[PDB]
Ligand binder design. Sequence first.
Ligand SMILES: OC[C@H]1O[C@H](O[C@H]2[C@H](O)[C@@H](O)[C@@H](O)O[C@@H]2CO)[C@H](O)[C@@H](O)[C@@H]1O
Ligand SMILES: [Zn+2]
Lengths: 725, 8
Amino acid sequence: GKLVIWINGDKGYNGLAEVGKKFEKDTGIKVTVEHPDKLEEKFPQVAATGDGPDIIFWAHDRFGGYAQSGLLAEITPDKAFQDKLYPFTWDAVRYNGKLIAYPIAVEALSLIYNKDLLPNPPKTWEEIPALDKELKAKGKSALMFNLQEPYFTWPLIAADGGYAFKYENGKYDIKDVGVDNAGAKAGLTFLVDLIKNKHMNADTDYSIAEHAFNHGETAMTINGPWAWSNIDTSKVNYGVTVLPTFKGQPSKPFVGVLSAGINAASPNKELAKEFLENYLLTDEGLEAVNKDKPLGAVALKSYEEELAKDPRIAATMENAQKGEIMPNIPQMSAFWYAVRTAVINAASGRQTVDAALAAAQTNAAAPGLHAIYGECRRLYPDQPNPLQVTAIVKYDSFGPDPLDYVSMYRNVGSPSANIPEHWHYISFGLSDLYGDNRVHEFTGTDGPSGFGFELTFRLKRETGESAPPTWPAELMQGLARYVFQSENTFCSGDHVSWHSPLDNSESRIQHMLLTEDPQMQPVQTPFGVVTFLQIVGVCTEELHSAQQWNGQGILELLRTVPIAGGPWLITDMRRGETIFEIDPHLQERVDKGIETDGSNLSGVSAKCAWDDLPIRTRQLESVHLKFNQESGALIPLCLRGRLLHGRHFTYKSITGDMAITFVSTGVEGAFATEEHPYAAHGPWLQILLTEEFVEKMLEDALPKEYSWPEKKLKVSIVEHHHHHH
Amino acid sequence: SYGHLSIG
Ligand SMILES: OC[C@H]1O[C@H](O[C@H]2[C@H](O)[C@@H](O)[C@@H](O)O[C@@H]2CO)[C@H](O)[C@@H](O)[C@@H]1O
Ligand SMILES: [Zn+2]
């Protein structure tokens, strides 16, 4: 068959390609080495569909995740082979008692310094600001390193007592995260202080720092072994040394073990095993890769002995020694995303240190949030850190806002599809983000996460708009408040009467329909499934049309009209006409729908009640029903629209636990007999009505009173539910 | 298939 290998772009992929060529020479099987961007993200996406590589290279910390997802084949090396490598490297690639990857090399960050610009590098971080002054005097800077990846800033954060997950009982505690403790705040504050005092730039990334150092523009940098090759080429006289201490304590870099995993879906596990065990993991192969880009302290003893002499490796291992090996537990990716954002926002000043690290601390231990974010990353790779509306006080502590975050993305749309540019709002909170019963009942992997959905919204972008408006977030908060108060889940096709302009302007868009988000795909989390329901602004007439007929139809009609939505159903608040005013004929089709199929509405949430002329199962001779005007206007719909078709109709009260199910003859599951029309299991009431009684009823200013020998009906004009416990 | 009225 074939061999496809994925390895990160900063690693020695050409040497590996040479090893693959030797494998091809000897075996005849071709080896394709690729280095796609963000491979650690793509692999778990693609591997499930079976279009992943045969081998995947990365630090061990990802592999436990993959392994948990069944994406990695168990490796089966004999003892003889295991003897060649260090036990701790094996430990690093061990997950739930199974080996999920082959260890290649030990990696740790070091202080790299220019000997000519700086013969005596600082032992402490506190020295650097002063040093930067001296260097700036002669047009140079002290320190530049990658600030876009938390990997590089972590050693400083970890120094005074920051940690990822607390290691306890031979295990990691997923509830005890150490990112918002004093040491972390101190370290990150110091970093931010370096930036504030203009000793570093917040936007500094890998290539910038590398350039700066290799061109002798900065005296120091922070990087791993792989970086040396380019420095060697730069002919800069450099030294690799121990990282600076902070508050008298050593920087504690996360030690990573470069490892090779085998795709669970690969049919060439044997080819892979052969290649990995008998070609790569040898002195000559590893030397070749190391020749290309230094691996650091390799896991292979025989080659380890040969390379340990190098003081660079010695330094790597000193720093490694002062640090801790990374956990490989599945939650690490959540940890890294969380800390990545905090460092970025803290450095950019978008957030304070405390706010950022509090947010990271909470978010790392939040799988549902992480899962939704994943889908968002897939949809918008270009916007890693979007602007977010965040509730100051979270709902679990009874802040007013049930949505913890609302993400706002810029969606460029498609000019060819004639779908205009717009803002994409995505809510976080209606689903189970945390799973610790702070807000939602924990239901497990099967069933809905929280209410089982999140809200989305697509708002027409103005050309003059630099940033997305925030009012749709409040709109969503309103919607969410309703959902939590009423316990009513939203589904695609439902309608929502708002009776107010959504942006509270003079807009005619006073109502909403709900549909499936056109891009956001449903997601599986350890706490359940999350679907994404998009909000679509509509006019009162269109709502009435959706009520009288069905949501889906009106939605499609709205799709066929670009200015009212188009295929992706974008909302335009400055829209002045209904679709019926824009295209008269369309009206004809609603009227076409109602006449042939009737109404789609299984039931509705409204102000209503029933009573006698609470607890227990009861049959009743007489009944007294109560409605508001709004729900009352649907009674004609309830009767003709559904009862005539052997269908049921249900009114639920939002205020109470009250419910009324209208039933016709010929329905199934009904306990209502023709002899005993009215019966209730409690607040839930069913009444069976005959078409006969239906027509007379249909034929027959508040209060407006309707009466019969068996029943009385009025139309007229206390309790609060909290959370999803 | 379901309606929610005057939620706001
Ligand atoms: O920054 C988050 C990132 O940290 C580690 O990534 C390292 C990687 O281990 C090194 O081989 C080298 O490429 O630098 C990377 C940082 O850009 C973790 O391995 C990774 O899971 C995590 O996302
Ligand atoms: Zn509660």
